[PDB]
Structure 1
């Protein structure tokens, strides 16, 4: 079945958990440092830190005051 992303926000002029301008959430970034290594053509590699996104973003209905 289709996903249902937002739990009802914290509970002119209608107080609806729905019908609120939706924003998208933030992706999660994780950094891995690679140990210096060598390769078949005998080159020594010092990469640094590689950052990758573990989780894609998801929709969110803002809490309404």
Structure 2
């Protein structure tokens, strides 16, 4: 019979950057916060071994 593999999807890798307090153009103070973005998304990991 032809073989079987298990599709494996890799986890997303995330990155979080802390932001320091800041004032915008409308003079509202922004206390320190953080924003997260995904650097490398999830994908199928083709099989090391078919059988």
TM-score by length of 1: 0.58
Q: Relative contact order (C-alpha < 8 Å, sep 6+): which is higher?
A: 2
Give 5+ residue unaligned stretches, structure 1: 1-15
Task: Name the TM-score, length of structure 2 as normaliser.
Answer: 0.71
Where does 1:7-26 land on structure 2 (aligned, <5 Å)? 19-26=4-11
Unmatched runs of 5 consecutive residues or more in structure 2: none
Deviations 1:2-48 (A, max 9, x none): xxxxxxxxxxxxxx996302121000011101111001111001251
Paired positions, count: 50
Superposition RMSD on alpha carbons, in Å? Answer: 3.0
